[PDB]
Design a protein around this nucleic acid. Structure first.
Lengths: 61, 202, 174, 125, 73, 50
RNA sequence: GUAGUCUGCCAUACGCAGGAAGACCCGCUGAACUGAAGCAUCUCAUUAAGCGGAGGAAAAGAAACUAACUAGGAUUCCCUUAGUAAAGGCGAUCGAAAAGGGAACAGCCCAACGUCUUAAUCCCGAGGGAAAUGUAGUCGGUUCACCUAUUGCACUGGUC
RNA sequence: GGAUACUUUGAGAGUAGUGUCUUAAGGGGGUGGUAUGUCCCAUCCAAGGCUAAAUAACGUGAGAGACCGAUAGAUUACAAG
RNA sequence: GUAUAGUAUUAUGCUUAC
RNA sequence: AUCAUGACAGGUUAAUCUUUGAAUGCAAAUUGCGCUAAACUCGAUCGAGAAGCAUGGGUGUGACAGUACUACA
């Protein structure tokens, strides 16, 4: 653990880390893409969402 | 524009200009192996109808299916049981030949999502089909809102489960109306009708 | 000896000569000569499209965009690469015959690449031209009309057909 | 077959006894439904949970010409007459249906007055 | 208005048809119209094209093609 | 035997060190009685089939 | 000879595939016992076993749909229609759909085609690469109406 | 889409699918449950794609009972696959 | 597929398909 | 080991993780037969251990093959 905490600091904040120092996780959760990419909006869709967003409303008593 | 003319040229396959071009291609395809990769698709216009867009990750593969129907499997041509089911040769496959084309190409290439296929050529022996594939892990397809639905794990091997355009034809999912009422799935619908239901109050 | 793909290349070249070719596909075979074809590129060379980083902060250069110019009737003349799927450019000639646009059919697709700044191109056309030039352009438009005058008289009922070997010809004369 | 009973008509020649479906879920199913629509109406707040608003609509065949039921959604014609934006009216809590165009003049006058009563006392946060 | 009114697609149908030409069964049908066997010719098209209303459209097309050659010849 | 392989010899080792009486101190610990060692055998009576 | 391309094969850098499980789900393949008091069509059954493939659900889904009205309006499921219309050595048996009531309710966009946009696009991290065999974008123009911020996913233990 | 062959359906001069051969049109085409031509009226625009919720659950993991009480209840209340 | 003799079809050459 | 420098059959997470197995350096009824730029670690320039090296396909990078296409000689 004296090795690993020192040796992780060398490779942390850098692209393509070693396999030992990657976190464990599941197979399914790695290969499932990050929710920004799934949820990102088309240039048609984003421009209409300027106006047609899910706005709040209510009724009078 | 330009791909008006490619469409309207390809309508008239049986003509001296077009029949010449298809024979030269079909000569080349007989010498090469069964499943083989292309750099770019032989029919650009027809590719984009079925969902091809020329960027990194999108891959194209020709494949060769044998014409004619598939015979029954028996040991020494023996048939048993009731004589209504004694045929060997007059069978036809329930799958289309496009489906059998895609389903061969699926078995050879896992790690690779079939978008769709289409027809390129035929002779006496074989049909030829040009399957579009996608590498879903590649950043260009991982990005882009229009295409990245493929990257989800629900769409792993569509050709096996019959969710291609050719897949939806055999399943009879290509029509709406009185004829097509029975076939969610042909099977799913059958089960609902046949389940025996015992309500709690009777 | 020859690793199949080498054997296919050669057989494909010979098999195109041996068959009765259709006339429209055949018309593609005729091409501008190296006297005139060198001159034509200079006009194109002068009008070469811009590269990236040569950007700050002319020429129509593709099958889809060239058909827009031809059907608008903006194109002064068209250039077509001699070889490409042949389906894409077969009708370039049928359009330019109909609407009375003059057109080359220039050899190599790759050199139309080099002048534009890609690996391939298959299609070039000029819309506006330049006041500074124009004079150079007329000479080339006259050279294409007068040069291809030989061909399109022949080509419409021409079949570039069976060349029929050397060793086959010896057996016939027996 | 014996005695004076009616012909024996039991559709029980298939193996029905493998494909049995008992409904002991039903009162637990009622709560799975019910706990969903409460976890809806908190998240939907401050918007009204009984919505979205839907048109009054005559049923088709000869033996239901009398009766009138809830439809799917208002026409783009009926919204514009009432004073609404067809695309945006989905997010104001009014269901919209582009397809329906056999509704004659009498049932339009209901559904315009139906939307006006909504738009009279709709307000915005 | 919102109708197509097809100029540009139908212009493309002309010049491809001029370039490619006629298909084997249409040439066989045109030969039967030259001989004056119009009734046998429509039976030939009905087998090929399948239905009656498909076939009678193609005759009314192909009769106009042969009557264009009457002015030329 | 002789001429046994090594992984054959590994099994025959484990088959003879496992063959023994159960220890006395488990009956003293757990207080259960009448537990026999299941992998006891005799060479003549029961063959291994390995 | 060299300089581009096209096609093929080899080597290498970086992430991916396989195997488990399989009640439910999707696509193929496919019996016979049995019933018809025999048996061959029919039935058991588009079932069992077999082959191939997914997910926490799957599949379906936004009209080449119903209808004939005082008209409905994506898909799925429950009730009823209905043991009916129909099928059938018209024997044994088999057997739906629209409408009606209810649960839930959400719509979207490529292709080409706008005969326009100087690739205006994307990946890699000062510049390389893909792409014109086509990536990206709202059809153009006038004129009144009007809308302005929230929405998904994520949520912890202890004491008395 | 057509002819023909096989499987399939309540679908009946073909409900759906598939083989073989054949193969359209686009001021036009599909559907309206009896084949075929023919005149009206009505209703939709195929051959590309994505999409939550209601729904299923003889597998695996972690409160209830008018059930069984050691020949019962699971093959197994125990050093049991 | 193709070239030539003769009664759309018969005859015997061609090779590049096969 | 006791008012804590905190007992242990408590519960997580992270290390370590033998021979195997999709099993993946090539095999296998065998503890058989290989290969490697640096770095790592003992070993005193040069040995060993440790750790690498599979097939298939994707994008990039490089190299080779061709009387395939083309221009300039």
């Amino acid at each position: 653990v004296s090795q690993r905490k020192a040796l992780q600091e060398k490779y942390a904040k850098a692209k393509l880390v070693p396999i030992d120092l990657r976190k464990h996780q599941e197979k399914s959760l790695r290969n499932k893409l990050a929710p920004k990419y799934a949820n990102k909006l088309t240039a048609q869709e984003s421009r209409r969402h300027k106006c047609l967003f899910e706005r709040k409303f209510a009724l009078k008593a | 524009g330009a791909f008006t003319y490619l469409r309207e040229l390809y309508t008239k396959k049986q003509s001296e200009v077009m029949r010449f071009i298809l024979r030269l291609r079909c000569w080349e395809y007989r010498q090469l192996p069964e499943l083989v990769r292309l750099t770019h698709p032989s029919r650009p216009d027809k590719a984009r109808r079925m969902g091809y867009k020329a960027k990194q990750g999108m891959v194209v593969y020709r494949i060769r299916v044998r014409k004619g129907s598939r015979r029954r499997v028996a040991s020494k041509n023996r048939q048993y049981g009731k004589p209504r089911t004694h045929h060997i040769y007059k069978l036809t496959p329930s799958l289309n030949l496009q489906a059998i084309a895609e389903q061969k190409a699926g078995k050879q290439l896992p790690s690779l999502r079939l978008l769709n296929s289409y027809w390129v050529n035929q002779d006496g022996a074989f049909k030829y089909f040009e399957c579009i594939f996608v590498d879903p892990v590649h950043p260009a397809i991982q990005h882009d809102a229009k295409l990245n639905w493929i990257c989800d794990s629900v769409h792993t091997r569509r050709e096996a489960r019959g969710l291609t355009a050719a897949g939806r034809k055999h399943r009879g999912l290509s029509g709406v109306g009185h004829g097509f009422r029975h076939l969610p799935s042909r099977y799913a619908d059958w089960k609902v009708r046949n389940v025996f239901k015992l309500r709690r109050w009777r | 000896r020859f690793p199949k793909y080498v054997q296919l290349q050669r057989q494909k070249r010979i098999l195109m000569k041996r068959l009765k070719v259709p006339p429209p596909v055949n018309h593609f075979n005729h091409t501008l000569g190296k006297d005139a074809a060198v001159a034509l590129f200079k006009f194109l060379e002068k009008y070469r499209p811009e590269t990236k980083t040569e950007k700050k902060q002319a020429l129509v250069q593709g099958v889809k965009n060239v058909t827009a110019a031809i059907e608008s009737k903006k194109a002064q003349l068209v250039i077509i690469a001699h070889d490409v799927p042949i389906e894409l450019v077969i009708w370039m000639p049928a359009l330019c015959r109909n609407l009375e646009i003059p057109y080359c059919i220039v050899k190599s697709k790759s050199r139309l690449g080099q002048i534009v700044g890609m690996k391939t191109c298959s299609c070039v056309a000029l819309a506006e031209v330049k006041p500074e030039d124009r004079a150079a352009f007329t000479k080339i438009v006259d050279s294409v009309n007068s040069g291809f005058l030989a061909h399109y008289k022949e080509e419409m009922h021409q079949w570039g057909g069976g060349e029929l070997s050397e060793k086959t010809i010896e057996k016939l004369k027996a | 077959v014996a005695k004076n009973n009616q012909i024996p008509n039991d559709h029980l020649r298939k193996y029905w006894y493998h494909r049995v479906k008992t409904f002991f879920d039903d009162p637990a199913r009622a709560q799975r439904r019910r706990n969903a629509r409460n976890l809806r109406a908190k998240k939907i707040a401050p918007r009204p949970a009984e919505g979205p608003l839907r048109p009054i609509v005559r049923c088709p065949t000869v033996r239901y010409n009398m009766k009138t039921r809830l439809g799917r959604g208002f026409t783009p014609k009926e919204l514009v007459a009432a004073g609404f934006d067809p695309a945006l009216a989905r997010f104001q809590g009014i269901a919209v249906d582009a397809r329906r165009a056999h509704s004659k003049d009498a049932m339009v006058k209901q559904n315009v007055e139906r939307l006006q009563a909504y738009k009279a006392r709709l307000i915005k946060v | 208005g919102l109708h197509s009114s097809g100029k540009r697609v139908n212009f493309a149908r002309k010049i491809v048809h001029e370039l490619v030409g006629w298909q084997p069964y249409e040439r066989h049908t045109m030969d039967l119209i030259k001989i004056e066997r119009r009734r046998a010719a429509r039976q030939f098209l009905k087998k090929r094209l399948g239905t009656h209303r498909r076939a009678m459209k193609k005759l009314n097309t192909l009769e106009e093609v042969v009557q264009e050659e009457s002015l030329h010849h | 035997a002789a001429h046994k392989t090594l992984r054959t010899k590994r099994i025959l080792c484990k088959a003879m060190k496992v063959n023994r009486p159960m220890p006395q101190f488990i009956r003293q610990m757990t207080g259960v009685r009448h537990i026999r060692n299941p992998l006891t055998r005799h060479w003549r009576r029961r063959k291994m089939n390995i």
